[PDB]
Structure 1
């Protein structure tokens, strides 16, 4: 709500992907989407930036990363 976003971008797309996240990882994602918006030179955070920034600073793969055959 503090930041300037396109009304096209939507938070509902994000919430489902990760099943674990904390209030400090979220802080970093918004910085990254808003830092990346400066390279493209966009006033708003477009939904392309929001998605890219989501996939970085998450990970949480160490246990099924390449060992997915335990299900």
Structure 2
């Protein structure tokens, strides 16, 4: 999908989730490259699990960025390729 389809997902799941006013969801939307709907659900869950290890409560901007690169690639490295340029 594109940024237009995913922007209705992040904002919808974060409604029941507890976030911070300093964190911006549109910052990750630009960083999202052709993702699916299930992977987004794992990002919001992993961001909440990292708050327990850091002794936090609300989801900050750093919790979303650190939990991004972990769950964004589900196969090997990047789209099961390396680099083509």
TM-score by length of 2: 0.69
Gaps of 5+ in 2: 1-14
Which has the larger Rg? 1
User: RMSD of the alignment, in Å?
Assistant: 2.6
Change (3 A) 1:59 1:41: same
Q: Which whole-Å CA distance do the structure 2 matches of 1:24 and 1:66 have between them?
A: 19
TM superposition shift of 1:48? 0.6
Runs of 4+ with >4 A deviation: 60-69
Q: Which whole-Å CA distance do the structure 1 matches of 2:59 and 2:31 have between them?
A: 19
Q: Which whole-Å CA distance do the structure 2 matches of 1:53 and 1:63 have between them?
A: 16
Deviations 1:13-65 (A, max 9, x none): 10111221111000001110000011111110011111001111112786878
Number of residue pairs aligned between Structure 1 and Structure 2:
71
